[PDB]
């Protein structure tokens, strides 16, 4: 029985649970920092990266979270999560837990009028995924270490590295489990 | 590309759950919000309340200072509309504001209909007190609900009252036999097929925050206990005489809800 | 061990009893109180009462003005949660607040729905006016009852009335016949079992202190007089010339209900 | 071994389910009624909707005929006293009815107070309209239900009231906020402990039969469909031109409740 | 896993059901004849005897019941059931099932005022077991072939034979599932031949 | 035929009267020290210490109360009683009878949150006996000519010292009355003497 994190200190925490379930693995909602001990991966939801960033600080996840990735834990990042996840983010000399080898930039297609669905090709998935783009940001640049899983008008908005799975779009808030499916295998991978 | 889609509109205030929504009145104010852990904030020009208090029109904002506020902050930003205003609706969004509240605190410019919210791009908040009226506005277009409350009084009442209502009508919904609801909906005046589905999907399918009256750290807490998916809380954060500390007070309390050791601590001297 | 059983929150309560509890606003006067001889101390940020004559909102206390009182005494303390305020009780409950008064002066959190008080540790008691109305908070899990009385006027009257309407229509309940018992819990809107057991005990199966109004030693007898177990005072006891002196009078009163040449002693 | 507890008053009412309990009023109605599958019969001197319709006093049957139906057959024997009427419950008991009626259908001896039914050791049904009203039965110690419905008619229509209300009341106790819960006792008028452990159950603690205007196979079936544990039946079956033949019907109907083409057959 | 079916025409049915799925087995009320098939053993619950066999005459479940007993599929009687697996009833002419050598008087304590609850000892059980006996009957005589697991004051009260489990109480009136393990496991012996 | 007084002033009196009674002996309530004189043996119940020390220094019955016990009238103090009679109070300078050679520390489990149950084995108690502990003090050390009759957990919870008898828990909140009758006996015992 693999069980997969959810960190709840804010966002769309229940649509990851739920498709965590759906892929037959046990989901836990992570609010406090002891209970990354209790989960074999850590999914970062959508939601507001700034929100999440302030209340990581105050409850002093942050090192904790590096500690769980030092251990070769999988985690993934979805939109705001992604954004947690980059390495850099364009215009902040900020950034957040600093794990995945990517640039990103925020709010890149401009505000929530412009937020968007479009299907996408990802690699491991076979036929289209319908990609959801709520006030998405976009991944500039990956490192050479970054495997890209899918593009959108020449822009990356999925890639792995690793132990590491980023999107910038949100599978979540769609019924197809495909891409939660292939975090449940990076996390079947680890636990051997 | 699509845009405008109702999996897109709900889907931005599915991204706000858990969080707090905070009303500013300049561009300060906004960054105080942002670097509490606002989710959101609501831009105005001045407090609805003490408009309609000092007998005034309380209209749409200008324009002016909800570019200010989108220009603060890198976090959605809201604004209001009079209830059937439907202009003031369309230049809120040809202004690229992310949610617009439909909203009772302002001045209604139709007293009986409200805004088609379906035709719009940009999603909309609307506010409700019951069941009946919360699918009412959900067929009209609505993508997030919030409680009605209290405006103006920091009394806490009508906002549990409100919850407390939809979420009792829900779980009655969801558990009665399927061959009674014809005779709910037309009870509760709603669309019959809306009805049906919260019943299939065991839920409502927006998501409905507490709105009108959270004061404390205590009281944002209580609306998360009692079943919000998040809280929007008024400008009287920042007529606190530390409202930072406030703001992130009323972040921390919603975010762990249960942490009653933590609330304690954030209920003191404010 | 076990903590929070129904015998430990009731009991906690019975021994209150033939005391006082004094309302206090700091530790200045909690420790006069303590000194006087209350066996509790109710902490308030500001009189409740005053907060809605300026048609303001009552809320739970500071929990700073709570540890200061709390920090100053050895008897217990007691504070206030806004009816149906789920997160207020359970923060008092987490500062380790002895008793919560889950309390019609402060602003209602919720006008349907009482606390569901079974399911704290920490015990409440709770006003009432009647029989029907003391056995729904009972059985929502209120430990201890007190009279809603009047408050904030000092006038006897409506602590008398409802003292005397418990009394009364327990008395009733008691000598009636048993198969008379549904109809009488139906027109109480009181909990069948609760009754019977009342009727069964020969008495109500929690404290019940009189509240709102005791304004004089005469009052404080008065009530115990009248079946109180005991009695809260609010906060004019320290609007007096010496309070001090009038706490004292209180405690005496209400310990030695029927001496009445002392009781006109205390009065003057 | 004990005699007269509440599961063995309960259990009785269990073994029931799923059958059809038949009025009749003497030896060769019962015999036609155990041989066409009946359950139970309900022993009655003469048709009460008739003589309360006359509009004289019905009454407890004549002992002499409860006896006689008893002595007829192997299945239980039910019998109806006045609501109230102390005597005639327990003279229904020392004559070993299975099960006592207390029933609305005769003239009620006490229009205030029913039966205290705790104190009985034969168990009875009672009627109701609602679930608090049927909580209320329960709590006085009725060990089975059944719906009022409209006797004399023929008419489904209050038994189908009857049944979908308490059903759907049931649904929403089960699915609603324990917290909610007091509130909602107040406003049916039931005691608490019976709504929170029917919460806690998923159900009502004692079975629920229609009753009071089955006519035909169809209605039978339609009770069951609508959750009703069991079906009374009235004399009319004794009407028809082939009483034995429609007996059977109804309990097949009420047997195979969702067999449309069996029961298109039996409605002929 | 396990399906063991309940009768279904009449009676204590759920309660069975509930007793089934408490031991970790699936419950099918059998209604039809021919969802016999559909089990690896059958419970006869408690309720009327007299209903169940004019049911069971009018639906042509006599042969299947004994068709079902022929493929070795282990039978439960509760009372009304007990009276069903009974090879004769005393005073009558017209025995039904007719598969547990025993001989039944019904109705052998008077009526529903004398039901009682009684403690037993039960072969196979440790701690005593409440048995509930509603309008109970009582085995006059058990034959060479069937077992006595349970006697109060000297009366047979639950019987084994073979495939074939009787008692004259209803232990599916209580929250102790334990004879229903007893017969889970008959089944699950029956299941492996 | 005995009577024991409890001490009216404040608390938890109607319990301990109770219990006296159902041993068979006649209980009164004492609230004047005139009515000292009028009994065999007095229990200090269980309430708030601060409380019956304010009122015993008013109605100046520290003296009356020392004379009882220099009569050699048994006396039993429970919670707050244990806390009046006790020779020492851990953190004042003010102590009250002093009779029992004990320290006390007032309120040492915590708060009313962390008032427990919990079954104790007591000294000339068959059976355990539940020890209900409403914000108690606990017994810090006892003296050589004090008699340990129960510990919690390695702390001492109830004492004998010739005449004193002193728990820190509330036996009288209990239907079981063997403390109490432990009391009586004593009370009888010097009435014989
Ligand atoms: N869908 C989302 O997670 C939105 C992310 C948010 N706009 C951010 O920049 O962090
Ligand atoms: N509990 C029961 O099953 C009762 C059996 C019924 N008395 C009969 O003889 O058939
Ligand atoms: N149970 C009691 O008697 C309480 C004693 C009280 N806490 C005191 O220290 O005086
Ligand atoms: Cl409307
Ligand atoms: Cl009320
Ligand atoms: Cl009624």
Redesign the interface.
Known sequence: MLTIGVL????????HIHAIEACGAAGLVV?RPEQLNEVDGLILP???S??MR??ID?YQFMEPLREFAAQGKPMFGT??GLIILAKEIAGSDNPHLGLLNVVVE??SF?????????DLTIKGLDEPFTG????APHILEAGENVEVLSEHNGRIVAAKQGQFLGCSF?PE??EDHRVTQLFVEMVEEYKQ | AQTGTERVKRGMAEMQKGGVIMDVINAEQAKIAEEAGAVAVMALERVPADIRAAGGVARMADPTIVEEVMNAVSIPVMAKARIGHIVEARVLEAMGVDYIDESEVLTPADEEFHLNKNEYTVPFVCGCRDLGEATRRIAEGASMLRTKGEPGTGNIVEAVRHMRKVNAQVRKVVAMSEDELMTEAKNLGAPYELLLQIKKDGKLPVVNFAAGGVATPADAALMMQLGADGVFVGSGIFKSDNPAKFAKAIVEATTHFTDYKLIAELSKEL
């Open positions: 709840g200190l804010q966002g769309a925490v229940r649509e609010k959508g939601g507001e700034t929100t302030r209340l105050t939109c705001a925020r709010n401009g505000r929530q009028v412009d937020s968007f669905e479009a959801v783009f709520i006030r949100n808030l769609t």
